Amino acid sequence: RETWGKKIDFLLSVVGFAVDLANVWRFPYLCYKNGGGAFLIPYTLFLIIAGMPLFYMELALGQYNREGAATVWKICPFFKGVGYAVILIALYVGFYYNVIIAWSLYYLFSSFTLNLPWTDCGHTWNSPNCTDPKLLNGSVLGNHTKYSKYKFTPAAEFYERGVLHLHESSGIHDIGLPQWQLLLCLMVVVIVLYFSLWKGVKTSGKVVWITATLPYFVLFVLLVHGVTLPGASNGINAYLHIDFYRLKEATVWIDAATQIFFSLGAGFGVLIAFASYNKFDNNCYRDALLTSSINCITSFVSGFAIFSILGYMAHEHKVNIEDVATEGAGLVFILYPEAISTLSGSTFWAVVFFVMLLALGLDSSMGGMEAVITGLADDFQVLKRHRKLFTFGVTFSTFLLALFCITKGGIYVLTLLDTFAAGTSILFAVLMEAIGVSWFYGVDRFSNDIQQMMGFRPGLYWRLCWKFVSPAFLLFVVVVSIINFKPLTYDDYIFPPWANWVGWGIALSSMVLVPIYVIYKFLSTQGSLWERLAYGITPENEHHLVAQRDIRQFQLQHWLAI
Amino acid sequence: RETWGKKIDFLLSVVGFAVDLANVWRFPYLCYKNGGGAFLIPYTLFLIIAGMPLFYMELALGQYNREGAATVWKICPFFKGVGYAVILIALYVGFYYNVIIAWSLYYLFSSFTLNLPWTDCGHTWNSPNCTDPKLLNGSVLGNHTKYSKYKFTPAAEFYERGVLHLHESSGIHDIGLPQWQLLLCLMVVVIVLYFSLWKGVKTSGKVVWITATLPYFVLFVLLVHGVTLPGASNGINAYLHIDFYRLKEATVWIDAATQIFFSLGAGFGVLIAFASYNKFDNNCYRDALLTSSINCITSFVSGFAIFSILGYMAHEHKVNIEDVATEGAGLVFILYPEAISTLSGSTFWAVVFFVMLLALGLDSSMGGMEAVITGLADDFQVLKRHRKLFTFGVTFSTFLLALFCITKGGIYVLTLLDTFAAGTSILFAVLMEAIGVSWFYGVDRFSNDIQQMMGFRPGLYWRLCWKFVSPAFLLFVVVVSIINFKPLTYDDYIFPPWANWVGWGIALSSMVLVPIYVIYKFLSTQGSLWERLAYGITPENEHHLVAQRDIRQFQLQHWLAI
Ligand SMILES: [NH3+]C[C@H](O)c1ccc(O)c(O)c1
Ligand SMILES: [NH3+]C[C@H](O)c1ccc(O)c(O)c1
Ligand SMILES: [Cl-]
Ligand SMILES: [Cl-]
Numbered sequence A, B: 001r002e003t004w005g006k007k008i009d010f011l012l013s014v015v016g017f018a019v020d021l022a023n024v025w026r027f028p029y030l031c032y033k034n035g036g037g038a039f040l041i042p043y044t045l046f047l048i049i050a051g052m053p054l055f056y057m058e059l060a061l062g063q064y065n066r067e068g069a070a071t072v073w074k075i076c077p078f079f080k081g082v083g084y085a086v087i088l089i090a091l092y093v094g095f096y097y098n099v100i101i102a103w104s105l106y107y108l109f110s111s112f113t114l115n116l117p118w119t120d121c122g123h124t125w126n127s128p129n130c131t132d133p134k135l136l137n138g139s140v141l142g143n144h145t146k147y148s149k150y151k152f153t154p155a156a157e158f159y160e161r162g163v164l165h166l167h168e169s170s171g172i173h174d175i176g177l178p179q180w181q182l183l184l185c186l187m188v189v190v191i192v193l194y195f196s197l198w199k200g201v202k203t204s205g206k207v208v209w210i211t212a213t214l215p216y217f218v219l220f221v222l223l224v225h226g227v228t229l230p231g232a233s234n235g236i237n238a239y240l241h242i243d244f245y246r247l248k249e250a251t252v253w254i255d256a257a258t259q260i261f262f263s264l265g266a267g268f269g270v271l272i273a274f275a276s277y278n279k280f281d282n283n284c285y286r287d288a289l290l291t292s293s294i295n296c297i298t299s300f301v302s303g304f305a306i307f308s309i310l311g312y313m314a315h316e317h318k319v320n321i322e323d324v325a326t327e328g329a330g331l332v333f334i335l336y337p338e339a340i341s342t343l344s345g346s347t348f349w350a351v352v353f354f355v356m357l358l359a360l361g362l363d364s365s366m367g368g369m370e371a372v373i374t375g376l377a378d379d380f381q382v383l384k385r386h387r388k389l390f391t392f393g394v395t396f397s398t399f400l401l402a403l404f405c406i407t408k409g410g411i412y413v414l415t416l417l418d419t420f421a422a423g424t425s426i427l428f429a430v431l432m433e434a435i436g437v438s439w440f441y442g443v444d445r446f447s448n449d450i451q452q453m454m455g456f457r458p459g460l461y462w463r464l465c466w467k468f469v470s471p472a473f474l475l476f477v478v479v480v481s482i483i484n485f486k487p488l489t490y491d492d493y494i495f496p497p498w499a500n501w502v503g504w505g506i507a508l509s510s511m512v513l514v515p516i517y518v519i520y521k522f523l524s525t526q527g528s529l530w531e532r533l534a535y536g537i538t539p540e541n542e543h544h545l546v547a548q549r550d551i552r553q554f555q556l557q558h559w560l561a562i
């Protein structure tokens, strides 16, 4: 196993994976559908929890076992099914991430013209629906159309007609055929990912140098414009308004936990592989703290700019903020182009913002795919040697499934699919991991490992969260998502029951595949039940200790100790 | 490598693969759309050609190299891409064969009731379309509906509504979701195939004992009824009527060649694997002659009974034979149920005919899948050991693609898909094979091998057909299918251009994959162009002869000899 060349390499890698498509793509609409500040109060709180130990924990794991995402479960081989589930999780994440990168690449190719397509409502690649969308500049009176949701704006019409072509699909039942422009964009994306991940992990770290600088500045520029917008105050006041009646709803906490675990990287195995490639004496404490702080600041400024753009669009279109924009994965493609058009020289800023999105999305996707490849290679040593022949199959499967997900009705599937799996999967994933580090491997042996690694023992609060706080909160949010599940629905389209059935089917598929491997390891071991349990709950390198009638997990001190 | 226990085992195996779903399923409608006797004159003629040497040839091949479908190309490793193409050919064949077996299993499950569904036109699992179908017994007057095609009959309505549910699909663009009844039937079929092919080839040979007896008798029974039908004479006269103006059409010859190569088994690698499992001293001459004669007699009697049923239905519904039934893979499910209903005790005869269809279809499918598994195992020795873990993946891929092909609009895809690939593929396949045995390996070395095997040298006519006649006819039919290609269309539905584009895409995919492996072997070899060509055109066991500057293919005597 090789390591990174310098600290800056994996530092900028984990930074670009922190400030990636995840935050700027999911936090805006997720905070928007939960009512601004009503989403901020739990999320941030949950943040610190799911930010401080767990991330750190994963890092320490990767720094101790020095294995892949699934192969680090050699201290407790029973709970290795989560290592195989996070692989499929990250695979789905890479699928819809590459779809989003293809969308952003199409936007970049379209924004090269001086007369930008989303500037007005005409036959300029926007594909107007029977001349229904009306420009704010052309209209000299109030909006007569129904204002429950505004899908007749230049940006939204260009997004849903010229890009996705959703008008040619009735729903998920009849999706259709993949668009050819999206097909070419996806081809370019998968080719870039392959040529970036075909040689090895040494390729990573060079491109991300342009990453750490480019989003922030652009985002900063948005803030420079954000306060200057005329109607931005109406969105800023709503973003900083705490709705306490919405904190009593389970959907807010579910979305907060999912967004945290999705943006931080916990539950995908990317952090595990990155720490496996890190040095043995690397300080995971400061890295985790800096990553959590950067994610918090980035999410805060992104939400601030998004609500400023929302207030501006509400003041322009004379609609309410609750209905001025649609809820879904396409919120940014509707909001940001308008704010760019407002600025002088909109072409340059649009190109810069789109290439920033492309860079961060490609970084996140290459990190996820590298994590998957590292896990499957450390699991199957045959795949570690055929580096250029194993990435090809993964990229081809990604290309096929993204073609399936870029149909006329793809936006109905992908998001839904994502959400469903992600939510359940991510929770279960970290839950399983926590349980191990809480109960089976132990919270004191993990602390001793961290002390051997970095020279100091973790704090008592960290161990309490590792053993009691974080696992209890994860079980709570799991039970909440199970009991208070709501039927998924798009902006206006309501999904049929079989779509939710397939989503829960994938969720239960992962949630049985973890105990599928549990039972597989239980049956593979030969001997009495006690001997099999001892072999399962003890590391492989200490399996001889099972033959010496010496087991620590059977002792009450192991479970009782903190 | 193991061999069959007795001669009867592989004899009945190749017989059941000869009289299988292929003949009774494809010859009826193919001869019906080509005008009866107008199809018989070329087909039978082409038969003897594509019947006598080629089949025999493949047998001898399997009896000499004793390898899989692709692995027998060790005497000429350059032309091994055809061995990899016939694998995908047989894979597609198994896919749509298992779809047809699921259809037949649904028919068997439905025919258990006393009041059979296709007996009349009512709400009895037939799903009538707005009461449009009219029973011949209920109607006391002539047919007022358009008679260009009769899709308003009980059998056809039950087939297209209660079984396929084609009314819920507009076309190939929006197929839909797999039916649950067809899903369960396909599950049962793939489970039977797995439990029949999980242990080994020794499982084959026991079930086929019930095969060799069951179709023929049933077919014989049909003949016993065939002459007794009142309007059967009008169909018998048309079947024995030679339309010379249709022999000048390319479609007739194309369909004849495709049906011959599809029913005999040439071009799938099943015969190669069966002969690889045969004894070394087995007489391939008599086996090939008996197989060709049995196929000819079975096709003749099947066409006779089919045209008798067509004449009866034309005399009953008062329509013409050219329009009394639809053209496609579902002709038998429309014709045979009516003839069974005409007989007393229709339930017993229906159950017997449906279980006969199930038996022959399962035999053909298990033969094809066993051929594929044997080829991929002899190619990859790792797959030969994991017998129970490699059949599972193939069966699961078959299950997935058959689910894809059993949608509401599956009948529009599957048949089309099949035809397209089959035609081009099968021609190219045998063509490549012929070329080898004609030019690269040689027709005299093959004769010497057959003499060493069975004790006698093949006749001069056989060698002439091996070298000149069969390859020339195959190149002719290939050029004919390429130049005179016609846009495919269903009974009434016309397929869009992209369906034919995908069909030709799969065809060209195989037709480049063969030279893809050619160029792969050319580039893999290191040395001068002459040395690489010598290594490519010489057997592996004689590769040392390349180092001795001794090559026979370079000599003019090898090409000139007959
Ligand atoms: N933050 C994005 C997340 O780490 C992720 C997960 C799976 C992926 O395939 C991917 O590209 C990114
Ligand atoms: N006659 C049937 C033919 O041999 C065939 C070809 C491919 C298959 O997958 C199959 O099941 C049967
Ligand atoms: Cl976040
Ligand atoms: Cl035939």
Ligand code: NA
Binding pocket: A017, A018, A019, A020, A021, A022, A023, A262, A263, A264, A265
């Ligand atoms: Na993130």
